[PDB]
Each structure stands twice: as structure tokens, then as C-alpha cells.
Design an enzyme around this catalytic site. Structure first.
Site, PDB file in Angstrom:
ATOM      1  N   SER A  43      -8.043 -10.310   6.628  1.00  0.00           N
ATOM      2  CA  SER A  43      -7.825 -11.724   6.324  1.00  0.00           C
ATOM      3  C   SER A  43      -9.059 -12.601   6.532  1.00  0.00           C
ATOM      4  O   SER A  43      -9.021 -13.779   6.169  1.00  0.00           O
ATOM      5  CB  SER A  43      -6.681 -12.300   7.150  1.00  0.00           C
ATOM      6  OG  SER A  43      -5.403 -11.773   6.778  1.00  0.00           O
ATOM      7  N   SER A 103      -3.330 -17.999   8.501  1.00  0.00           N
ATOM      8  CA  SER A 103      -3.453 -16.707   7.818  1.00  0.00           C
ATOM      9  C   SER A 103      -2.234 -16.410   6.949  1.00  0.00           C
ATOM     10  O   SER A 103      -1.767 -15.277   6.864  1.00  0.00           O
ATOM     11  CB  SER A 103      -3.794 -15.555   8.762  1.00  0.00           C
ATOM     12  OG  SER A 103      -4.662 -14.634   8.086  1.00  0.00           O
TER      13      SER A 103
HETATM   14  C1  LIG Z   1      -4.956 -10.712   7.475  1.00  0.00           C
HETATM   15  O1  LIG Z   1      -5.687 -10.001   8.151  1.00  0.00           O
HETATM   16  C2  LIG Z   1      -3.470 -10.546   7.365  1.00  0.00           C
HETATM   17  N1  LIG Z   1      -3.053  -9.228   7.808  1.00  0.00           N
HETATM   18  C3  LIG Z   1      -1.986  -8.622   7.284  1.00  0.00           C
HETATM   19  O2  LIG Z   1      -1.323  -9.097   6.367  1.00  0.00           O
HETATM   20  C4  LIG Z   1      -1.606  -7.299   7.949  1.00  0.00           C
HETATM   21  C5  LIG Z   1      -1.485  -6.095   7.039  1.00  0.00           C
HETATM   22  C6  LIG Z   1      -1.132  -5.979   5.758  1.00  0.00           C
HETATM   23  C7  LIG Z   1      -1.141  -4.705   5.300  1.00  0.00           C
HETATM   24  C8  LIG Z   1      -1.489  -3.765   6.199  1.00  0.00           C
HETATM   25  S1  LIG Z   1      -1.814  -4.568   7.653  1.00  0.00           S
HETATM   26  C9  LIG Z   1      -2.870 -11.693   8.228  1.00  0.00           C
HETATM   27  N2  LIG Z   1      -3.815 -12.076   9.297  1.00  0.00           N
HETATM   28  C10 LIG Z   1      -3.545 -12.205  10.590  1.00  0.00           C
HETATM   29  C11 LIG Z   1      -4.763 -12.525  11.436  1.00  0.00           C
HETATM   30  O3  LIG Z   1      -5.601 -13.294  10.984  1.00  0.00           O
HETATM   31  O4  LIG Z   1      -4.998 -11.791  12.421  1.00  0.00           O
HETATM   32  C12 LIG Z   1      -2.626 -11.339  11.190  1.00  0.00           C
HETATM   33  C13 LIG Z   1      -2.523 -11.269  12.580  1.00  0.00           C
HETATM   34  C14 LIG Z   1      -1.664 -10.480  10.391  1.00  0.00           C
HETATM   35  S2  LIG Z   1      -1.202 -11.352   8.855  1.00  0.00           S
END
Ligand SMILES: *C(=O)[C@@H](NC(=O)Cc1cccs1)[C@@H]1N=C(C(=O)O)C(=C)CS1
Ligand SMILES: CC(=O)OCC1=C(C(=O)O)N2C(=O)[C@@H](NC(=O)Cc3cccs3)[C@H]2SC1
Ligand SMILES: O=C(O)Cc1cccs1
Length: 259
Positions: A43, A103
Site C-alpha cells: 500500500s 489505506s
Molecule cells: C496495503 O498494504 C493494503 N494491504 C492489504 O490490502 C493486505 C493484503 C492484500 C492481499 C494480500 S495482503 C492495506 N494497507 C494497510 C497498511 O497500510 O498497513 C494494511 C494494514 C492492510 S490493508
């Protein structure tokens, strides 16, 4: 022990691969650790998508207030803000804020769709002189973070250089630069990451990421009280697909490189 030795030890004990790039804008000096190696951005790539929309707004005074329709079918795996607006609209500015500060993955996807696809985000990065960044997928699949997969990757140094340009340098016109900085400073997801390794009263703007392979990332601009800004990228990834994320490792890396 040197900063390099400390980072080596942190990495070894952590059971992963750590990438660090710190740029000290006081003198343009750097602290680098695996800084030319590729890592899945997860992200953290939302910064580039939001900035690409900000760039467009420099030539369209109505863009940031443009309405975007949020449908139930737009919801994905993580969308705490967009889900509040199903059947309603959010502006492109509100989508930038949600993407960066919470996010929100639906918000990211609306930014990408508005731009015309992940490749448009890559082109924006290239327009800033970043030859390294690539966005290949939408959310959630951009977070698969598979070892050795080049999709949706950059290097710590490339991202530090580009984040410096975006927030403190030549990339955006002033109003847009300031908006990006305001967004980053108001991030809610970064408490335990870079911020946790710094003095509590330092102002920080950051964007986190968390993906598979326990991939745990944060990119930050840091404003000390009596010193020029620092730009810090900390990327971390692990050998097992289902590994836990390790925000504390990013905090530790931040503490080491600012000690
Ligand atoms: C961004 O990193 C995003 N991550 C996800 O959607 C997790 C996954 C999707 C598929 C496999 S793993 C979002 N960002 C946050 C962050 O900025 O840390 C998150 C904690 C999870 S949602
Ligand atoms: C909020 C968040 O999820 O923090 C990440 C995290 C970290 C971290 O580094 O910040 N971790 C730790 O410090 C690890 N915790 C443990 O190893 C404790 C154990 C729990 C169960 C068996 S050992 C993981 S537990 C998960
Ligand atoms: O409901 C739909 O399919 C279209 C929408 C209108 C407004 C928000 S979503």
C-alpha cells in the site's frame, strides 16, 4: 557497533530481508541498506497514485472536487471509509485522503481507475525521473508480495528519492505538494512503524503497507525540531507467505538510523 552492523543484526535476528534508505536533506547524505534491491511496495504505492491525481489537478481546477460514485460492488478486502459511502459519492480529494490516511483499498482503486489503470501510475513516476517504480495491479492483488516477483515493486533508494521530490522538491506545484504533505501528516495507520522509532514530538508524514510474505513497509518524511527534514523508507519482507507483519522492525530500523 556501526549503523550498518546494527541493521545487519536487526535483519538477521528478524528472519527477513530489510531495505532502508534515509536521505538527510541537511547535506544530502544517505544511509543505505539493500537500497538498490526490489521490494513489493504494497500500500505504499498509494502515494504515487494520489500524487498522480494531484498532478492532473494542476491543469484542471475542478478535478479534486469531482464526484465519484461508490457502489457496493466496488468494495474489496479493506475499505473502512468507502464502505460508509456506498450509494453515495466521494470526491477525488476525499478518495486521496481515504487512500492515504486509512489505506482504503477501494479508494486506491478509484484513483487508479480515474487515471486509466496501473500503467498510468508508472508513467507518472517516470515523469518524476523514477525509472524504478512499477505499478502492475489494482488492490488487493498488488499486495501479494511474492519473493522475486517484479510486479508492484520499487527499491528503497528510488522511493526515498521520489518521496523527497514529491513532498519537498520539484514534482508538484506548491498547492498540490502542500496537500500531499497534509495528507501524509494525517496518516492514522503508522503509529507502530517509523513513528514509533522517533522522538514523540517530531512531526512525521508517512504511508504504510502490509502484504503477504509478512511484507511490512513504511515511507516517511520527518521534520525534526532543529534540523532539516529526513526522508526514510523502510521495507521488510519474510520467507513464508503467511508470515505476520512486523511493524516493530520498521520502528527499530528508524531508531537505528536516527541514533
Ligand atoms: C496495503 O498494504 C493494503 N494491504 C492489504 O490490502 C493486505 C493484503 C492484500 C492481499 C494480500 S495482503 C492495506 N494497507 C494497510 C497498511 O497500510 O498497513 C494494511 C494494514 C492492510 S490493508
Ligand atoms: C500491530 C501489529 O500487528 O504488530 C505486528 C506484530 C509484531 C511487531 O513486530 O510489531 N510482532 C511481534 O513483536 C511478534 N509477536 C510475537 O512474536 C509474540 C507471540 C505471539 C504468539 C506467539 S509468540 C509479532 S505479532 C505482530
Ligand atoms: O448504485 C449504483 O450502482 C450507482 C451509484 C450511484 C451512486 C453511488 S453508486
Amino acid at each position: 557497533n556501526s549503523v550498518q552492523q546494527q541493521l545487519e543484526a536487526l535483519e538477521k535476528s528478524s528472519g527477513g530481508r530489510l531495505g532502508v534508505a534515509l536521505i538527510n536533506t541537511a547535506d544530502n547524505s544517505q544511509i543505505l541498506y539493500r537500497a538498490d534491491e526490489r521490494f513489493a511496495m504494497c500500500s505504499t504505492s498509494k502515494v504515487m497514485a494520489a500524487a498522480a491525481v494531484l498532478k492532473q489537478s494542476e491543469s484542471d481546477k475542478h478535478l479534486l472536487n469531482q464526484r465519484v460514485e461508490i457502489k457496493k460492488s466496488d468494495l474489496v478486502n479493506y475499505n473502512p471509509i468507502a464502505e460508509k459511502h456506498v450509494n453515495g459519492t466521494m470526491t477525488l480529494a476525499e478518495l486521496g485522503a481515504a487512500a492515504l490516511q486509512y489505506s482504503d483499498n477501494t479508494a486506491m482503486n478509484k484513483l487508479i481507475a480515474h487515471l486509466g489503470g496501473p500503467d498510468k501510475v508508472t508513467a507518472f513516476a517516470r515523469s518524476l525521473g523514477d525509472e524504478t517504480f512499477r505499478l502492475d495491479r489494482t488492490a488487493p492483488t498488488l499486495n501479494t508480495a511474492i519473493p522475486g516477483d517484479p510486479r508492484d515493486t520499487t527499491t528503497p533508494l528510488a522511493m526515498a528519492q521520489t518521496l523527497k521530490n514529491l513532498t519537498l522538491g520539484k514534482a508538484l506545484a506548491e498547492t498540490q505538494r502542500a496537500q500531499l504533505v497534509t495528507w501524509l501528516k494525517g496518516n492514522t495507520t503508522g503509529s507502530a512503524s517509523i513513528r514509533a522509532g522517533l522522538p514523540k514530538s517530531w512531526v512525521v508524514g508517512d504511508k504504510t503497507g502490509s502484504g503477504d510474505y509478512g511484507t511490512t513497509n513504511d515511507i516517511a518524511v520527518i521534520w525534526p525540531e532543529n534540523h532539516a527534514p529526513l526522508v526514510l523508507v523502510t521495507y521488510f519482507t519474510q520467507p513464508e507467505q503467511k508470515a505476520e507483519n512486523r511493524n516493530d522492525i520498521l520502528a527499530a530500523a528508524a531508531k537505528i538510523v536516527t541514533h
